[PDB]
């Protein structure tokens, strides 16, 4: 499992990370299409003997949500990378015609549309 | 019926 907290890793809150947490993630987490992505893929339970050989970095929305809650990221680009990894993992392991690939593509389109309204200049927030 | 059942039928 991927780590969601690390005192040795620089992390903080920015205006963009706060937007991804309170606006973007809040909308994607409740979306109908998000259910296959809300927790890690369990290769043992699902019978995927080659999943962890094909997928080098598993990622799911629950891990991203916990990283946002724990101020794990330093910049919004790190959170964008985790989303990109989650979507691309599905594109790699599954066939282009599989329904789950279209579910990921649709969620990715929503994600990118919501990110378009993100604050364009990243600024660290320290007031609590 | 469950999440695991539907996840299984979807990914396969
Ligand atoms: N499938």
* Two tokens, residue A28: 């994607």
Q: What angle do CA A47, A65, A89 make, to 5 degrees?
A: 40
Map residue A128 onto helix, strand or coil.
coil
Please tell me which of the candidates B4, B6, B10 has its beta carbon nearest to residue A45.
B4
Cα gap A54→A93, rounded to integer Å: 7
Interface test with A, best of B7, B8, B9 (most A CBs within 10 A): B7
In this complex, do B11 and A45 lie within 8 Å of one another by their Cβ atoms? no
Alpha carbons A69 and A5: distance in angstroms, whole number: 9
Question: Hey, where are the domains in chain A?
Answer: 1-128
A80 with A64: CB under 8 angstroms? no
Q: How far is B1 from chain A (nearest CA, A)?
A: 13
| Tokens linked to A31 | 């979306």
Distance of alpha carbon A12 from alpha carbon A84, whole angstroms: 21
């Amino acid at each position: 499992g991927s780590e969601v907290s690390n005192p040795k890793k620089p992390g903080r809150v920015t205006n963009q990370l706060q937007y991804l947490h309170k606006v973007v993630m809040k909308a994607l987490w409740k979306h109908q299409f998000a259910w296959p992505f809300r927790q890690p893929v369990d290769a043992v339970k699902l019978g995927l003997p080659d999943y962890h050989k094909i997928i080098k970095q598993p990622m799911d929305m629950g891990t991203i949500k916990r990283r946002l809650e724990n101020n794990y990221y330093w910049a919004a680009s790190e959170c964008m990378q985790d989303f990109n990894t989650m979507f691309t993992n599905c594109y790699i392991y599954n066939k282009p015609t599989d329904d789950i690939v279209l579910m990921a593509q649709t969620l990715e389109k929503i994600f990118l549309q919501k990110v378009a309204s993100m604050p364009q200049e990243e600024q660290e927030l320290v007031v609590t | 019926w469950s999440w695991l059942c539907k996840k299984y039928n979807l990914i396969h």
